[PDB]
């Protein structure tokens with residue numbers, strides 16, 4: 440929790456909806472009556488609905504760090520950082536400053552960023568003052584050979600374009616190079632290893648079948664044979680102002696297939712899944 444979403448139709452659209460949002464790519468996850476957007480929810484919700492660990496798509500903001508050989512750099516480490524940023528979720532990483540002669544007071548800052556990137560600093564000073572969530576790193580009472588730590592937190596407001604920026608301690612030539620990359624795309628299972636997926640009449644895209652022309656259904660199971668995909672839906676809805684199969688079933692090649700329940704003695708029946716029995 441929490442995931443706010445509206446009629447999401449792809450894994451990326453789900454990820455973009457907020458850091459609490461995750462996407463279930465499980466084949467047939469959306470049973471009768473359930474639209475594609477049910478695939479997008481908080482991790483605990485999907486788990487509870489039977490989405491397995493390998494089927495929850497949930498890329499996360501993260502930092503990778505690299506240090507050059509030695510000399511290299513002396514005072515700031517690490518020398519290279521790569522961030523993968525999911526919108527709304529901070530990536531955190533630590534920069535160490537090691538005084539050599541100067542200076543007693545040390546500030547940490549970065550070059551101007553686009554409005555899409557928010558950066559704050561925690562300062563873990565040795566004197567031992569602590570600052571948190573500040574626009575700049577700031578430590579007084581810095582001493583030679585006793586390293587100080589700054590925690591850098593970077594948040595993107597969108598799926599950003601790959602860019603770089605630098606972090607520097609004021610008065611020093613040292614550079615921390617920060618590579619910034621988006622983390623918005625899902626790594627989903629494609630249909631390469633099974634020609635029967637989506638009945639071999641559509642493309643599998645993070646659990647959703649995108650059916651070839653002349654085929655409809657969650658699994659592309661229904662050939663239309665030019666009966667319009669409308670005519671077909673018409674025998675699944677009671678009136679033009681009503682919803683298909685009462686919101687409780689799928690229109691499967693012109694006929695409602697109703698949600699089955701594990702609850703005794705619940706039965707959803709009728710031409711449009713309109714009869715909701717509690718005593719069957």
Ligand SMILES: *[C@@H]1O[C@H](CO)[C@@H](O)[C@H](O)[C@H]1NC(C)=O
Nearest residue numbers: 466467636638656657658660
């Ligand atoms: C998905 O459901 C369809 C029912 O139309 C079925 O043909 C297919 O075997 C199912 N695939 C799974 C569970 O992997």
Ligand SMILES: *[C@@H]1O[C@H](CO)[C@@H](O)[C@H](O)[C@H]1NC(C)=O
Nearest residue numbers: 531532533534563588589590
């Ligand atoms: C950075 O260092 C601080 C202070 O030692 C520590 O509490 C924090 O967990 C570190 N942050 C990361 C991202 O490793």
Ligand SMILES: *[C@@H]1O[C@H](CO)[C@@H](O)[C@H](O)[C@H]1NC(C)=O
Nearest residue numbers: 669676678679680681682683
């Ligand atoms: C009937 O209602 C559906 C519901 O969305 C709509 O797509 C369609 O425009 C309507 N058709 C006519 C001709 O009334």
